[PDB]
Each structure stands twice: as structure tokens, then as C-alpha cells.
Amino acid sequence: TAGKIFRAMYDYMAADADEVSFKDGDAIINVQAIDEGWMYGTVQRTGRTGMLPANYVEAI
Numbered sequence: 001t002a003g004k005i006f007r008a009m010y011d012y013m014a015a016d017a018d019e020v021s022f023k024d025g026d027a028i029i030n031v032q033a034i035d036e037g038w039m040y041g042t043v044q045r046t047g048r049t050g051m052l053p054a055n056y057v058e059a060i
Contacts (some may be wrong), residue, residue: 006030006041010056020050028057 006028014021020043022028028041031049041057042049 002030004030004059006057007060008052008057010053012053012056014048014050018051020048020052022052022057028052 008022008026008028009024011023012019012021019038020041022043022045027044029044030039031041033039037054038051039054039057040050041052
């Protein structure tokens with residue numbers, strides 16, 4: 001009961017191993033989430049899993 005689809009609209013650049021890196025248009029999903037502070041998804045472009053900036057990605 002959670003096959004929604006998300007999309008990134010900002011070309012972010014992972015500076016550390018805490019998050020990943022995706023460009024505007026990449027496709028990702030909300031595998032999970034903590035509460036208030038970035039989220040967690042798996043970029044389907046390269047398959048890199050890591051935290052994502054919630055203030056940069058959004059649902060569509």
C-alpha cells in the first residue's frame with residue numbers, strides 16, 4: 001500500500017556518505033522516513049541508497 005512516485009527538482013551533490021546524489025527529474029520513492037530532518041530513498045538512476053533533502057524533493 002505504498003507504490004507512490006516522487007521526483008527531484010534540484011541538482012543536489014552528496015558531499016558526504018550521509019545522503020546520495022540525484023539531478024532534477026530523477027525518479028525516487030519514500031522507502032521510509034524518520035520525522036523532521038531529510039528523508040530516505042533509493043535513487044533509481046545509479047541505485048545509491050542514502051538520506052535525501054526533504055526541502056528539495058517532493059511528490060507529484
